[PDB]
Amino acid sequence: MREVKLVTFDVWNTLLDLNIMLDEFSHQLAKISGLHIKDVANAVIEVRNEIKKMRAQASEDPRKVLTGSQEALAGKLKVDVELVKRATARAILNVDESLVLEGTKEALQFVKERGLKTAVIGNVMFWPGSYTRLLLERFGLMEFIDKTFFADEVLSYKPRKEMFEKVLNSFEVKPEESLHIGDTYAEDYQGARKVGMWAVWINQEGDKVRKLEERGFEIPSIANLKDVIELIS
């Protein structure tokens, strides 16, 4: 088979811890809005469930990949969307290194040491891709990332076809010469799989590396990415 030249990474729940970030955000939004933390925490889950359900079917207008979530949240809580934007800014300044998931920097180093190209393909919600890029840069991860592709900056989102192809084209590689790893089945796995790339789904509820189908695997943690990479090299 063709040799893998590019490994692409999802961010939330693959490299960084999403719940800590979402909790810091709910907290910060509740603080500046003077609202009860439970109402804010619930609104966040509702907006996230809704958009996740839409994105799986490519039903959200990519032009609102960011603004949509922000305005939906603002409306649920009856506040100016300006407060939502400010809350994300404060949350990004309040989180820290505890956000980095175990084995993350090691897996990135493994890829870069084999001479492979790396990239980040992440969707966005509530806060722009620029905020997430700030975190990657701040935790030293960007040292191992060659290119970053955030939904709001590319005007698309996983599992949409043009989102992955944009990345493949940027590195001038073919789908079969690429592998994408992410934790959202409907977004990362199916997205990369139907474009032709090798796909790896992180299922923390899993125990071992499993071949799910042709060009598709399931692994318990990013720590096992090196096993999949080595298996197909």
**Binding residue positions for Mg(2+):** 10
Binder to a second copy among 52, 64, 90, 112 (CB under 8 A)? 90
Q: Name residues contacting Mg ion, limited to 114-143 (CB under 5 A).
A: 122
Q: Is residue 148 near a second copy by the rule CB under 8 A?
A: yes
- How many other C-beta atoms are found inside a 10 Å radius of the C-beta of residue 157? 26
Nearest to 93 by CA among 44, 135, 57, 129: 135
Task: Pick between residue 11 and residue 30 the one whose CB is nearest to Mg ion.
Answer: 11
Report how far residue 34's alpha carbon sits from residue 223's, in angstroms, rounded to the nearest whole number. Answer: 41
Nearest to 183 by CA among 101, 110, 106, 68: 101
Q: Is residue 62 near Mg ion by the rule CB under 5 A?
A: no
Binder to a second copy among 131, 176, 210, 212 (CB under 8 A)? 131
Which partner in a second copy, Mg ion, Cl ion, none is near 128 (CB below 5 to 8 A by kind)?
Answer: a second copy
Q: Is residue 134 near a second copy by the rule CB under 8 A?
A: yes
String marking each residue 133-172 x if it binds Cl ion according to CB under 5 A: ----------x-----------------------------
Q: Is residue 61 near Cl ion by the rule CB under 5 A?
A: no
CA pseudo-torsion sign 32, 37, 39, 40: positive
In the sheet that holds 178-182, the strands lie side by side as 147-150, 117-122, 6-9, 178-182, 198-202, 216-219, 210-213
Q: Binders of a second copy: how many residues, by CB under 8 A?
A: 23
Q: Kindly state the tokens that stand for 6.
A: 């590019």
Q: Is residue 137 near a second copy by the rule CB under 8 A?
A: yes
Q: Is residue 12 near Mg ion by the rule CB under 5 A?
A: yes
Q: Is residue 45 near a second copy by the rule CB under 8 A?
A: no
Task: Pick between residue 12 and residue 198 the one whose CB is nearest to Mg ion.
Answer: 12
Residues 211/224, Cβ–Cβ less than 8 Å = no
Binder to Mg ion among 11, 44, 91, 168 (CB under 5 A)? 11
Q: What residues line the site for Cl ion (CB under 5 A)?
A: 143
Q: What residues line the site for a second copy (CB under 8 A)?
A: 67, 80, 82, 85-86, 88-90, 92-93, 127-128, 130-131, 133-134, 137-138, 142, 146-148, 153
